[PDB]
Scaffold this motif. Structure first.
Motif, PDB file in Angstrom:
ATOM      1  N   UNK A  37       0.652  -1.189   0.113  1.00 50.00           N
ATOM      2  CA  UNK A  37       0.115   0.089  -0.200  1.00 50.00           C
ATOM      3  C   UNK A  37       1.075   1.478   0.177  1.00 50.00           C
ATOM      4  N   UNK A  38       0.325   2.180  -1.289  1.00 48.65           N
ATOM      5  CA  UNK A  38       1.693   3.352  -0.569  1.00 48.65           C
ATOM      6  C   UNK A  38       0.726   4.522  -0.826  1.00 48.65           C
ATOM      7  N   UNK A  39       1.608   5.294  -0.557  1.00 49.08           N
ATOM      8  CA  UNK A  39       1.169   6.978   0.197  1.00 49.08           C
ATOM      9  C   UNK A  39       0.194   7.703  -1.247  1.00 49.08           C
ATOM     10  N   UNK A  40       1.988   7.903  -2.215  1.00 45.12           N
ATOM     11  CA  UNK A  40       0.706   8.351  -3.279  1.00 45.12           C
ATOM     12  C   UNK A  40      -0.872   7.614  -3.737  1.00 45.12           C
TER      13      UNK A  40
ATOM     14  N   UNK B  46      -1.679   4.862   7.245  1.00 40.87           N
ATOM     15  CA  UNK B  46      -0.370   5.632   6.286  1.00 40.87           C
ATOM     16  C   UNK B  46      -2.060   6.123   5.172  1.00 40.87           C
TER      17      UNK B  46
END
Lengths: 332, 335, 345, 326
Positions: free
Chosen positions: D133-136, D172
């Motif tokens: 899972x990413x920020x962007x 996050x």
């Protein structure tokens, strides 16, 4: 006394391999050894890989020349070659910075580097996933200590990085210490891989047997093989449960060795002689050696890399001469 | 420019050796003010430990900090101070050179190579865990960002320090993805400076050849997956871990030049502890503060104190004391 | 081998973690119904709520080793680090591998669906509890979860054993083996590897996406259900909703030697703590399961029959099921329906 | 003038209900020409460029069933960057399910989580799933869900998550959801545990507006809502994407049991497309093609296999088509 001949599968390999194989053949004919090679070479239809296995199941020993080129890797998997042994021992005539060294490097080779699923998370982010287990640490710890007793070695040193690898390298040395109990005739010690590399250059005479997991093994094989004389004098062998393949010791000798008749064959002939002692043809193993070890001391014939200018074809052909009844060996 | 350079004491042998350097730095009276400090792991409020905050300042004002030994952090399972200093100032490179001491007799006589190891991630981002009984798994990672960054640095160190060619060291067979990327970021920086010859060699290939003929290399750039193996291996070639210097270069120009001894208090305080490292570790640090002339003097006095053959230390085939050495240099820096 | 359960003289000792929220009060009450029912049980209260240190939860875990059974309120978490979850550390480090949840619809409590009666055996030691998360690079958070063959067998072994012992017929394996083919597929075969050994118990499977849809429309179609420790808790929570709310459904983490009984929900109800509106039936039914575990069935039946009686009173319904009575009144009822004379029924 | 829009009827009842929508869509008198295509796998595995071409220019789309080497849907997320998965569950006015007044929109990350997963066996008997899972991707799907909330006159937006277990990943995704919500204070923003959402949902689904969630548990929350209204037959869809493309679709499967057989319900594909008008801007033909269908069912005159009765793909279809002209 030996009706027929023991079949030994031989993959000659790509490059200076076959030329080195041919040297094994010629020194074998000359030598009057009862062994029969059969060869299957090695990417389109890898039927050969099972063609090779079948042979391997029938003979259960081999001689390889390092397919220069997943080819090599998938073969070792299918065979479950879990132990690798490199014999770093100085020839007497062939002087180096470290002389009269006698060491033996047993490295695991089923896990570690040889697993390690690698993948990408973000653009520019690569990830390595190495696995160390107790199944396979115990296995290679057993091998080492069994070998260390079978060959009369007095010391096993387990090489590790348990400073940084808290758990994984920790795990390994547990199995080594667990196994080390069974063999109380054998001095056990551990050593850090960074420290061991430096010790290997300064006082390499302090070791007997070194058993290490995979990462550090591919490196110490070559590091040791340098002390002793280089990539064409050092032999090795790998062991399955029931199999055994014999070969050259140093893994990546040269980016390219192109140019016929210059490669030194002392690695295969000494690997190959060690092969015979496996087939329990102990006397021929002890004479192919004694010839090779005694063409080196005579110094007349040497290969480009060892000093002189003599070719493969003439370094070979002087060995046969020395095997062919011109050997003493009357000491009992 | 009368510069100040922070100086961590060094635990165990650190006192004898740090002040040994100071006293030898008195001999040529280099413009160095020794703003003493210390970095004994302290536990920070938010949870994770933090360094002593006068050092985090003294070295954020002054830019060169010369380290020494680090008391082994075996007190409890907590962060290692070395790890704090490297992370804090984000020193992304560790440069250790290897020169054949002409006095010291060792089988390898013509050695002049420098090993630049990328010091951001790889091994140093160590996440081992457990999956089932006796099945540890490790997770290491290599990032294109700090790959190019040490590929960049490394050519720069050749040009800046007048070094003919550069070797990237790797394992692009076993781990193609992680190293192919690290190669790739070197290949791009190769074209940038085609005044510097660039080759690629395997980690294995290197080890085999450097033990037979070590002359052929001079700068080696290598990710952190391998660690100090290749660098510690060379140390043996020139002989000793106590005659070899090390220095962590960092971003924003900050930089800690250190020795790579241990913390063995056995002869520590026996006034017999060889300080030949932190001295050469600082000779680097002078050369990194432009003090070429203030350092080439300190050095050749130390190389011809050893080539001397009487005023040695016991760690290098002798019997004497750190006091006899430090002063034999002190009289020979005045010529 | 291990020392014996703390039962000497017909009385067992069991651990009681009162826990946060309304945990304290409801637990007290259980004692009150317990002392009144003349049950051979005493409560070695153990505290498990201080945060950031394992001094707290190492203690309860030892306790439960000592006595082999406990009853808990619900620890709340919200140290604040990535860390681990105190409630699950019990579950994982006592190898309490078999969360079970019984979902009969109550007759007093009328909701959208009637006639429900499900069993929800669920893996309680890997998968989610296995997660390893790290921030490799800022903005990139990777998470490694493990589903093995061993633990997937025993929950399937447990799910049928229980389904036979209970004289139920269908068993449904819930999974999302389609999307994640390798890992849920491993699980599913292991159910097959057991559904052969029990041929009379109908076996089946269902995608979890579909299960949640068939649950909220025609849920009477489920007997037993066995599912990996995954899918968050949709399945355990959709049924808790169906049958009337978290205040009613009461679950149990069995293990090989250990066991811990609790509310099926993980709620603490800090909103209504010390307000006498906390519904006691879930917790009370929990302890009824704990009694059947100690083989004191008679007392389990007695208290349970009484817990369901009180629930037939619309007057005794607490504010979570729409009523206006209180915990105290509710507890009065259940005590009015256990009539013991010379310690009997 | 007209509006040209790619289109891919699929397997099973797919081409049948598809053209059964063309019939009722044109029977509304509605401005859209259907530059049809057919996607299949060619090898680097890519899909046909006849579709890929057209829709880069045609922009929108419409879809139907499929089956399954890299599956059909996966190549549509990947190549058109269909990075959000809008899905309204609003309850039908005539079709009697116990959850009467559902009105929920379940935006969902279509790029990470499971769809970035890598199952890989660690040792014998030990699978291991990597997800990331990413920020962007979060800030982007977070932003999306307020835009959707603002545009379509939504009031609440609840991030659903399970930071009990996935403290780091969902922690996050929560971080980036807040950042977004502190730039859009028009929308009421709260966060709820995934446990609790299913607990409340089945108990009183009326408190739920827009639900934004990462893709870690993915599909299960959206299908659960669909259970509330009546099934996957009446559930619309949509996959807003980066280029400007936005493929609308129906969520039911291949439907091989009654492939021809004139036995199918298209209210999926219809309402999948009534959403397409609204994306496209044709609100006025929208409320027609819509309210014509909710009355088609409210009356109770006919009801196909899914809803139970006897009508066929044709009997229902023309039965709406005539109602639309009114």
């Amino acid at each position: 006394r030996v009706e027929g001949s023991f079949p030994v599968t031989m993959l000659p390999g790509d490059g200076v391999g076959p030329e080195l194989m041919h040297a094994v053949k010629e020194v074998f004919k000359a030598a009057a050894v009862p062994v029969e090679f059969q060869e299957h070479h090695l990417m389109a239809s890898e039927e050969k890989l099972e063609q090779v296995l079948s042979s391997m199941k029938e003979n259960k020993v081999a001689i390889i020349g390092k397919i220069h080129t997943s080819y090599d890797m998938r073969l070792r998997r299918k065979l479950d070659l879990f132990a690798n042994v490199v014999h770093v021992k100085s020839l007497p005539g062939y002087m180096t910075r470290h002389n009269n060294l006698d060491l033996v490097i047993i490295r695991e080779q089923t896990e570690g580097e040889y697993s390690s699923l690698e993948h990408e998370s973000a653009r520019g982010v690569i990830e390595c996933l190495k696995i160390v287990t107790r199944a396979k640490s115990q296995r290679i710890a057993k091998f080492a200590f069994d070998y260390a007793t079978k060959k009369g070695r007095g010391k096993v040193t387990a090489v590790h990085k348990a400073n940084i690898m808290k758990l994984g390298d920790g795990l390994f040395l547990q199995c080594c210490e667990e196994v080390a109990e069974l063999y109380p005739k054998i001095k056990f010690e551990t050593m850090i891989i960074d420290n061991c590399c430096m010790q290997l250059v300064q006082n390499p005479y302090q070791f007997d047997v070194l058993v290490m997991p995979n990462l550090y093994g591919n490196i110490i094989d070559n590091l040791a093989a340098g002390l002793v004389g280089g990539a064409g004098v050092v032999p090795g062998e790998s062991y399955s449960a029931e199999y055994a393949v014999f070969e050259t010791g140093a893994r990546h000798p040269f980016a390219q060795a192109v140019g016929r008749n210059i490669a030194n064959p002392t690695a295969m002939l000494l690997s190959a002689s060690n092969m015979l002692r496996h087939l329990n043809l102990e006397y021929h193993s002890s004479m192919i050696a004694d010839a090779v070890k005694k063409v080196i001391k005579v110094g007349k014939v040497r290969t480009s890399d060892m000093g002189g200018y003599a070719t493969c074809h003439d370094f070979t052909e002087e060995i046969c001469r020395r095997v062919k009844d011109l050997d003493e060996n009357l000491y009992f | 420019g009368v510069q100040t350079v922070t100086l961590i004491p060094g635990d165990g042998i650190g006192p004898e050796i740090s002040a040994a350097v100071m006293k030898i730095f008195d001999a040529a009276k280099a413009p160095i003010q020794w703003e003493e400090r210390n970095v004994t792991a302290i536990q920070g409020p938010g949870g994770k430990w933090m360094i002593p905050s006068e050092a985090k300042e003294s070295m954020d004002k002054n830019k060169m900090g010369l380290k020494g030994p680090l008391k082994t952090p075996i007190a409890a399972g907590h962060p290692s101070m070395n790890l704090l200093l490297r992370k804090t100032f984000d020193l992304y490179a560790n440069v250790r050179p290897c020169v054949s001491i002409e006095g010291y007799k060792t089988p390898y006589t013509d050695v002049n190579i420098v090993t630049i190891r990328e010091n951001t991630e790889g091994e140093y981002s160590g996440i081992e865990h457990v999956i089932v009984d006796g099945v540890v798994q490790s997770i290491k990672l290599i990032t294109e960002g700090a790959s190019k960054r040490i590929a960049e640095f490394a050519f720069e160190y050749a040009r800046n320090n007048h070094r003919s060619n550069v070797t990237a060291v790797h394992k692009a067979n076993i781990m193609r993805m992680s190293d192919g990327l690290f190669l790739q970021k070197c290949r791009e920086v190769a074209e940038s400076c085609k005044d510097i010859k660039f080759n690629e060699m395997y980690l294995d290939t290197v080890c085999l050849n450097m033990v037979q003929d070590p002359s052929q290399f001079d700068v080696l750039v290598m990710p952190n997956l391998y660690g100090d193996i290749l660098s510690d291996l060379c140390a043996g070639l020139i002989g000793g871990l106590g005659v070899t210097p090390s220095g962590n270069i960092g971003a924003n120009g900050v930089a800690i030049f250190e020795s790579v001894h241990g913390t063995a208090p056995d002869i520590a305080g026996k006034d017999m502890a060889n300080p030949t490292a932190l001295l050469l570790s600082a000779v680097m640090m002078l050369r990194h503060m432009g003090l070429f002339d203030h350092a080439a003097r300190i050095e050749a006095a130390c190389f011809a104190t050893i080539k001397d053959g009487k005023s040695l230390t016991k760690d290098l085939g002798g019997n004497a004391k750190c006091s006899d050495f430090t002063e034999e240099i002190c009289r020979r820096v005045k010529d | 081998t291990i020392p014996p359960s703390a039962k000497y003289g017909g009385r067992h000792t069991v651990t009681m973690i009162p826990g946060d929220g309304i945990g304290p009060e409801l637990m007290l009450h259980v004692k009150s119904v317990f002392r009144h029912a003349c049950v051979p049980v005493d409560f070695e209260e153990v505290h498990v709520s201080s945060n950031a240190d394992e001094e707290d939860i190492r203690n309860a875990i030892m306790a439960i080793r000592r006595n082999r059974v406990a009853l808990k309120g619900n620890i709340e978490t919200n140290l604040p680090p990535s860390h681990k979850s105190r409630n699950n550390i019990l579950r994982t480090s006592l190898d309490l591998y078999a969360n079970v949840i019984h979902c009969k619809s109550l007759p007093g409590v009328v909701t959208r669906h009637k006639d429900i009666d499900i069993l929800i055996v669920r893996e309680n030691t890997e998968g989610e509890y296995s997660s390893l998360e790290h921030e490799s690079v800022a903005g990139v958070v990777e998470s490694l979860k493990i589903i093995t063959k061993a633990k997937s067998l025993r929950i399937a072994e447990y799910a049928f054993k229980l389904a036979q012992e209970s004289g139920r017929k269908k068993v449904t394996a819930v999974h999302k083996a389609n999307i994640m083919k390798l890992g849920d597929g491993l699980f599913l075969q292991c159910c097959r590897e057991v559904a052969a050994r029990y041929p009379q118990i109908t076996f089946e499977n269902m995608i979890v996406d579909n299960t949640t849809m068939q649950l909220v429309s025609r849920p009477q179609q489920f007997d037993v259900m066995v599912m990996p420790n995954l899918y968050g808790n949709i399945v355990n929570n959709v049924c808790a909703g169906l049958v009337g709310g978290p205040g009613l459904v009461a679950g149990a983490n069995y293990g090989h030697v250990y066991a811990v009984f609790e509310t099926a929900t993980r709620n603490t109800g800090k909103s209504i703590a010390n307000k006498n509106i906390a519904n006691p039936t879930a917790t009370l039914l929990a302890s009824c399961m704990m009694l059947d575990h100690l083989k004191l069935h008679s007392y389990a039946t007695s208290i349970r029959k009484a817990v369901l009686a009180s629930m037939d009173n619309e007057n005794m319904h607490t504010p979570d099921i729409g009523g206006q009575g209180t915990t105290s009144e509710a507890i009065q009822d259940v005590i009015r329906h256990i009539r013991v004379i010379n310690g009997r029924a």
